[PDB]
Amino acid sequence: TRLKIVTIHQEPFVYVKPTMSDGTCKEEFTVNGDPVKKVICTGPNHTVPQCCYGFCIDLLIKLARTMNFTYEVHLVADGKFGTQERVNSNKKEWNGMMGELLSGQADMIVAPLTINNERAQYIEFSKPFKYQGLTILVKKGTRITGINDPRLRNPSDKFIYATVKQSSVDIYFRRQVELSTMYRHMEKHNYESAAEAIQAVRDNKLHAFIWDSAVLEFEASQKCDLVTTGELFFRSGFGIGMRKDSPWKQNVSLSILKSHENGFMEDLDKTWVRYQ
Amino acid sequence: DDNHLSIVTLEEAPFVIVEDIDPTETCVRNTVPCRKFVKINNSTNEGMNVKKCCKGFCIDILKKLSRTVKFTYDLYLVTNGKHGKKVNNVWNGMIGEVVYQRAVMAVGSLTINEERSEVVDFSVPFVETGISVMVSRGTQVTGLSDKKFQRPHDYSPPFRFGTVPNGSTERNIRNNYPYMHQYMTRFNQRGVEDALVSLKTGKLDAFIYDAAVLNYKAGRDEGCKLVTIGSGYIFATTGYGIALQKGSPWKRQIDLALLQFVGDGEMEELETLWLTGIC
Numbered sequence: 119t120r121l122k123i124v125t126i127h128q129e130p131f132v133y134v135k136p137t138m139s140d141g142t143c144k145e146e147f148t149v150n151g152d153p154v155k156k157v158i159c160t161g162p163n164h165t166v167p168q169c170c171y172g173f174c175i176d177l178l179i180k181l182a183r184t185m186n187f188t189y190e191v192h193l194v195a196d197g198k199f200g201t202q203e204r205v206n207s208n209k210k211e212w213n214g215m216m217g218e219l220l221s222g223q224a225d226m227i228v229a230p231l232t233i234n235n236e237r238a239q240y241i242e243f244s245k246p247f248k249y250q251g252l253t254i255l256v257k258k259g260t261r262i263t264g265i266n267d268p269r270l271r272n273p274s275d276k277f278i279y280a281t282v283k284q285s286s287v288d289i290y291f292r293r294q295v296e297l298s299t300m301y302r303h304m305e306k307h308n309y310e311s312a313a314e315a316i317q318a319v320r321d322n323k324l325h326a327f328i329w330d331s332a333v334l335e336f337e338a339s340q341k342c343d344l345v346t347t348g349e350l351f352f353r354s355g356f357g358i359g360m361r362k363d364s365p366w367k368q369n370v371s372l373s374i375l376k377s378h379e380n381g382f383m384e385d386l387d388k389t390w391v392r393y394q
Numbered sequence: 395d396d397n398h399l400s401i402v403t404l405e406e407a408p409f410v411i412v413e414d415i416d417p418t419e420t421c422v423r424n425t426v427p428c429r430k431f432v433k434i435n436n437s438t439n440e441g442m443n444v445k446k447c448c449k450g451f452c453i454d455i456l457k458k459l460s461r462t463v464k465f466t467y468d469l470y471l472v473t474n475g476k477h478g479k480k481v482n483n484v485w486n487g488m489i490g491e492v493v494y495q496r497a498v499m500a501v502g503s504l505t506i507n508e509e510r511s512e513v514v515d516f517s518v519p520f521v522e523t524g525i526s527v528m529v530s531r532g533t534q535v536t537g538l539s540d541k542k543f544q545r546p547h548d549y550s551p552p553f554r555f556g557t558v559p560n561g562s563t564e565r566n567i568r569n570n571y572p573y574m575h576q577y578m579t580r581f582n583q584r585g586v587e588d589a590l591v592s593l594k595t596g597k598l599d600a601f602i603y604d605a606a607v608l609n610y611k612a613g614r615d616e617g618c619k620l621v622t623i624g625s626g627y628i629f630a631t632t633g634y635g636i637a638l639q640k641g642s643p644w645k646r647q648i649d650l651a652l653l654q655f656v657g658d659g660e661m662e663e664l665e666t667l668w669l670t671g672i673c
């Protein structure tokens with residue numbers, strides 16, 4: 119019962135920090151006084167041990183305690199959430215955390231992983247542990263109505279928007295033929311990671327960043343030169359990822375339901391997600 | 395035959411709306427045939443089946459699922475109960491129909507929870523819900539976990555807020571916020587309509603209820619004076635889902651089709667058609 123857990127750097131759901139000189143994680147409490155539960159997570163810096171904590175790490179710990187299993191956490195090697203791509207042709211393969219789950223490098227994905235049809239054809243998602251959607255992040259001062267703005271629908275090299283490569287947003291814009299004009303712009307500017315994109319907005323190198331509202335709203339509450347706009351437009355949700363043969367599928371989902379019902383998710387949401 | 399599915403639902407507008415047959419003995423417009431066992435009186439199990447016509451948000455989902463998953467169906471309305479409770483260690487309502495194998499699946503405003511999930515398998519949610527709060531436009535409240543609700547005596551004047559008793563919401567508040575529950579009993583409402591009158595007439599400061607239901611009511615409130623909190627503050631988020639028999643061979647295809655509709659924009663088109671209001 120030693121499960122291989124794969125995750126990804128994505129605040130506030132997963133924080134990644136160096137270990138101390140002795141190879142342990144610095145003890146730390148939140149602003150509200152609760153102990154910060156940190157686990158050792160190996161990943162790229164060759165592979166080195168690092169410290170992981172956050173919403174999703176609290177969730178992992180609750181799940182491993184309820185169903186009573188041990189675990190080891192590592193960061194996805196390519197740093198991506200995961201889409202399906204053709205090889206070279208004929209054969210297709212997933213990348214990112216999706217690829218590591220389906221290949222056996224990981225037994226469970228605990229991350230802000232979006233539930234969609236493309237992925238659900240190959241893996242079992244749990245019930246949502248976080249409901250959210252897509253929104254747009256812009257520098258404070260940039261004015262756009264949302265996803266139907268003309269500067270988004272009739273793009274050009276003057277107003278640049280993008281999302282993260284090999285992600286659910288990339289899928290969402292690539293699968294719908296009616297979103298072909300938008301995707302053709304974004305594929306010229308998509309970023310390797312959400313952190314780079316958000317920094318590029320602050321640097322005025324990117325003008326709009328399309329990403330998960332649970333992440334973008336967090337960022338807006340921290341860096342007050344950034345704002346979201348338009349409200350939601352693709353109400354999705356994050357779920358645990360498992361292979362279809364997993365013997366844990368049932369209890370993971372029951373455990374998530376109970377944790378919504380007893381206020382445990384309310385505790386994590388208030389600790390990691392909500393700010394002002 | 396393995397392709398003709400028995401499917402149960404429950405009248406609950408706007409998710410399921412029941413009308414009568416055409417004055418051409420058939421169901422027309424955007425309605426599908428659905429039967430109902432109509433009791434002879436209130437002190438008997440004797441009854442008769444009656445042809446009806448059903449439509450609504452959930453029915454349009456069922457039409458979408460039928461063309462995509464490629465199954466035919468025979469739709470009928472639940473009579474022994476509503477959505478489903480474990481009464482005398484026996485499940486009634488829509489949950490009962492599925493557990494005791496009278497129905498392959500249940501389509502309606504059925505909330506996914508842990509308790510029901512131990513006897514049925516739910517699909518992925520097609521609509522978010524949870525415990526939400528509705529106030530008059532102008533009232534500053536975050537959500538259920540606001541201190542003005544947990545510790546109402548700490549503020550002057552204290553908030554006056556309540557729910558409808560003997561529902562899921564009251565049960566959840568009783569187990570999570572014991573003092574809030576005790577305080578709310580002197581403000582509980584007979585039903586949704588009496589709550590909304592209480593909010594508008596100034597007798598009540600906040601009404602705590604099902605999230606999807608409050609959004610539907612706020613969207614069509616006369617004068618747009620009643621508003622709900624932001625979705626990010628809904629407590630105990632969950633969804634409405636389709637209940638299937640545990641181990642059902644249909645759950646996978648139902649899920650793939652539902653997730654397609656969310657991605658297709660079809661689900662948004664139905665939301666706009668049936669649930670989105672003028673406000």
Ligand SMILES: O=C(O)CCc1ccc2c(ccc3cc(C(=O)N4CCN[C@@H](C(=O)O)[C@H]4C(=O)O)ccc32)c1
Nearest residue numbers: 406407408477478503504505506561562563586604607
């Ligand atoms: O304007 C109009 O005509 C209609 C106005 C109007 C009022 C009240 C309602 C609805 C619709 C649905 C509903 C469902 C429950 C209801 O029992 N639960 C919530 C869904 N889920 C139910 C369940 O799964 O058991 C239950 C619950 O979870 O508690 C209560 C009231 C209404 C519409």
